[PDB]
Structure 1
Amino acid sequence: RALRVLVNMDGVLADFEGGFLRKFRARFPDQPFIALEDRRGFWVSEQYGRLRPGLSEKAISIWESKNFFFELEPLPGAVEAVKEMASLQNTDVFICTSPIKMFKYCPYEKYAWVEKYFGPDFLEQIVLTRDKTVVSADLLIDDRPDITGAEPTPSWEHVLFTACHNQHLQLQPPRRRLHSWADDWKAILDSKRP
């Protein structure tokens, strides 16, 4: 009866796309790269693999490296918006994130990143899972278009958060977008309340 909102981390709170591109270019300066505006499809390494052989593996090595997740910059307005959202009456916010398969740094750095931008008390709001459909809530704000898993009927409405990779996608009505944290996330929340 508190409205419950799941907010994805990478591509919603944390600027994974920009951080990746920057780090890829510093480490592989004589390789071709995908400009952010040219990004298409969720999977970064797939697009890089299509661009040139061997490049999928180089791309992967960026996000597998120490400090990659920790050093991601917040997306504009993300921190302010989630902090306001969590302080709203009758509203519980969880940060829901799918860690990569290589687990040496990513889980740790995600907790550390949340501590840095939201504070120790916000660590209680983290959910790490590869399956978001088994987390129940009224809303999921997430930049991945296709969110599936073990539950064929999730309780949340998926609101697509705009990113380079999905900005041109035509969704099936009545699927809805949140265009950036400057867009009116409060009205989306209010539309789900009694």
Structure 2
Amino acid sequence: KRPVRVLVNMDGVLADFESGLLQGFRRRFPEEPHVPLEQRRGFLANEQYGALRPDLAEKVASVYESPGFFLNLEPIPGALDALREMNDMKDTEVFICTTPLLKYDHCVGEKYRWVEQNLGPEFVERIILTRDKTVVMGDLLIDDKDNIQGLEETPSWEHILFTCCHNQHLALPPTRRRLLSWSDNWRGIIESKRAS
């Protein structure tokens, strides 16, 4: 009876943060070692760059902390079509659920404008900003972060791992479901939740 509610993450799922960070890094520090997308491992890019050479952590962070960085991210392939499709499904409710940087200054505002410009004013109404996704109530959370924790020990949602460069090689127990891309069958996953 109930509609199925789907929480959809922003960076790594709708907005291509990883491609935008690499392109920004190579343009600004053309002389420096970089991490090709295929070689990304672990959720935080600055930690990987820092393991390469300590000062590069600060350098890569200066890219995502710049004015215009979040504003100008390109969409993830197929994301805008899929989210429009999903939003029009009957008895289906969509929210966009995103964690801003602690350096919020050029992040929070740019994220609202990104959604307005790439999706539309109607989607702006459905943004939730939070540093703890476990306190948001939904049936599914589609998110590229490997392991999501916070104050609620047993969240109401099932986490569906959205495949991204940094989690592609990650081994998951059979109980954890993945979405390989927006061409994978996210429609069937929604139906599995309705059925329970």
TM range (shorter): over 0.9
Q: Which residue of 2 aligns with 1:98?
A: 99
Q: How far apart in 1 are the matches of 2:84 and 2:10?
A: 14
Q: How far apart in 1 are the matches of 2:154 and 2:187?
A: 25
Q: How far apart in 2 are the matches of 1:13 and 1:166?
A: 16
Letter in 1 for 2:79: A
For residue 165 of structure 1, give the secondary structure of its aligned residue in structure 2. helix
Letter in 2 for 1:96: C
For residue 133 of structure 2, give the secondary structure of its aligned residue in structure 1. coil
Q: CA RMSD in A?
A: 0.6
Q: Which residue of 2 aligns with 1:139?
A: 140
Report how many residues are paired: 194
2:83 is the alignment partner of 1:85: no
Q: Which residue of 1 aligns with 2:10?
A: 9
Deviation at 1:39, TM superposition (A): 0.2
Q: Which residue of 2 aligns with 1:53?
A: 54
Q: How far apart in 1 are the matches of 2:73 and 2:85?
A: 21
Q: How far apart in 1 are the matches of 2:42 and 2:187?
A: 28
Deviation at 1:30, TM superposition (A): 0.5
2:31 is the alignment partner of 1:30: yes
For residue 122 of structure 1, give the secondary structure of its aligned residue in structure 2. helix
Q: How far apart in 2 are the matches of 1:187 and 1:21?
A: 34
Q: How far apart in 2 are the matches of 1:55 and 1:102?
A: 18
Q: How far apart in 2 are the matches of 1:122 and 1:78?
A: 13
2:156 is the alignment partner of 1:155: yes
2:175 is the alignment partner of 1:186: no
Q: Which residue of 2 aligns with 1:115?
A: 116
Q: TM-score scaled to structure 2, two decimals?
A: 0.98
Structure 1, 68-77 or 166-175: larger mean CA deviation: 166-175
Deviation at 1:100, TM superposition (A): 0.5
Deviation at 1:103, TM superposition (A): 1.0
Deviations 1:141-162 (A, max 9, x none): 0000110001011000000000
Deviation at 1:118, TM superposition (A): 1.3
* Structure 1: stretches of 5+ with no match in the other structure: none
Deviation at 1:173, TM superposition (A): 2.1
Deviation at 1:181, TM superposition (A): 0.6
For residue 50 of structure 1, give the secondary structure of its aligned residue in structure 2. helix
Q: How far apart in 2 are the matches of 1:75 and 1:111?
A: 17
Q: TM-score scaled to structure 1, two decimals?
A: 0.99
Q: How far apart in 2 are the matches of 1:76 and 1:108?
A: 24
Deviation at 1:90, TM superposition (A): 0.3
Identity of aligned residues (%): 61
Off by >3 Å, runs of 4+ in structure 1? none
